[PDB]
Design a protein around this ligand. Sequence first.
Ligand SMILES: [Cl-]
Ligand SMILES: [Zn+2]
Ligand SMILES: [Zn+2]
Lengths: 290, 61
Amino acid sequence: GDSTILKVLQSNIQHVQLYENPVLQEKALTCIPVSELKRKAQEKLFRARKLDKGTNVSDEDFLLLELLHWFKEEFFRWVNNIVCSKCGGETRSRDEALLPNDDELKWGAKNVENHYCDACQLSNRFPRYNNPEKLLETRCGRCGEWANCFTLCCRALGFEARYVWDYTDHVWTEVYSPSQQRWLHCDACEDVCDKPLLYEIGWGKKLSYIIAFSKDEVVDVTWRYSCKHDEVMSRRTKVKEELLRETINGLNKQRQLSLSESRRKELLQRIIVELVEFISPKTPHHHHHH
Amino acid sequence: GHPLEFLRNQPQFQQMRQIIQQNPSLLPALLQQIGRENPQLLQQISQHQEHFIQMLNEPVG
Ligand SMILES: [Cl-]
Ligand SMILES: [Zn+2]
Ligand SMILES: [Zn+2]
């Protein structure tokens, strides 16, 4: 229907197909020093098992932790306001957004930002590229660009990855741990792994709807990110709970028609784990910092 | 009308019910998984097992 929650489910479901493309994934391996992430993951893996108290194994999980770190440090950059092309100094945001010229539209930028230099009387352009192939080159932006490119990257290394859309304007990634038989919170943008209460408890965020999107599924993952489910419920005033559920089921069932029997069975076995967590809200936690 | 009544119309439970009604074979694995994630919920489930099961098998659209 006309509710915007449902309209974003469909773009995002569409949009997330782009990562699975070994053409783009190829392009995203050109960028990534696996040999080094994967070899630094093994060195942290060998030593961790000296204190075998450390249960699980973790392995592609140690690599996951190197993946985030690399991304934060060597690869992607955070854009506050971009520096002036001319003089190299401070710029400020004009609220009237630039119209995207032409190339910018091609690489998926609908909104372009005016980063004004007062010194130079120069409008600098901060395009807001939806297209992850452009982000491999631009290598910068805010949470949108960071989650969007980091999700292409997970897939690029054979990770099961979701794009996770929070209604209150943050986005991130989920990554499956074969190791731990569960999905894992990944915020490259904030350098955090497997600390889902970062947003509500760390930031004081008043959450509502958080929807995950992968090649296989759409999942309402809201309940992973909260221990105040009653308050979250109160803010879920955008759409009927029936209609949201109906619509994600519809989408999963349509888009699972072309999966295998056993695959579909693996999925239903995992969804039990998630669903149990969603009814197992945590007890409200200083450091979601450090 | 039990300790577990509050789960009845929670969204994530309504989804759990649709799945369990359409995948009965998953009940043991559910009970087991709840046993890991949520020891105190598994216990309240045990105190009042039929109530819980009636919740799970009640149809929801
Ligand atoms: Cl947490
Ligand atoms: Zn300037
Ligand atoms: Zn602190």
